[PDB]
């Protein structure tokens, strides 16, 4: 059981790292339909619907 905590202590704290990096946004924003802003082309960075 001591070996189970030691992995489960890792496996949760490994899951904690992923939330802190990415989910720094409160709000989901829809991708704009204009993938071209003022001459700048964002096609390979935004996902394609």
């Amino acid at each position: 059981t001591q070996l189970n905590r030691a992995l489960s202590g890792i496996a949760a704290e490994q899951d904690r790292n992923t939330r802190e990096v990415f989910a720094q946004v409160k709000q989901m924003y829809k991708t704009p339909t204009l993938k071209y802003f003022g001459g700048f082309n964002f096609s390979q960075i935004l996902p394609d619907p």
Binding site: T1, N4, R5, S8
Partner: protein, 49 residues
């Protein structure tokens, strides 16, 4: 009588106040797991099958 597992609670005077069958139902192993009658909200790893 059966040879199974009990958790016992003693007072400050050495008197049994309470007990819980550790083989009764899946909640009651958890109280035997963490050594507490009162248990917080969360997910808790208990024994293998």
């Amino acid at each position: 009588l059966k040879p199974t597992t009990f958790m016992l609670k003693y007072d400050e005077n050495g008197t049994i106040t309470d007990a819980v069958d550790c083989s009764q139902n899946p909640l009651a192993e958890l109280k035997c797991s963490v050594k507490s009658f009162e248990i917080d909200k969360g997910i808790y790893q208990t024994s293998n099958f």
